[PDB]
Amino acid sequence: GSSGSSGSRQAPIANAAVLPQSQGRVAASEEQIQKLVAMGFDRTQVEVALAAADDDLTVAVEILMSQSGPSSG
């Protein structure tokens, strides 16, 4: 028959880079750390991400999920 399904477009692929120094203000919220920590993340990881995320959760989560990559760092 027909399998249908035919769409999907414009998706946020790859993480967004962030230059050091300068950009360093409050943002990370406890609610988030918990929303992440609750999921099974580490406060630190949440913060670190939340940072690069720019106070973003939907993004941070992605970072938390795919934080440790195939590299030492």
From Swiss-Prot:
The organism's place on the tree of life at top rank: Eukaryota
Cell location: Membrane
Annotated ranges, domain UBA: 27-67
Family recorded in the similarity comment: Belongs to the peptidase S54 family.
Function summary: Probable rhomboid-type serine protease that catalyzes intramembrane proteolysis. May function in senescence.
The protein, known as: Rhomboid-like protein 15
Gene name per UniProt: RBL15
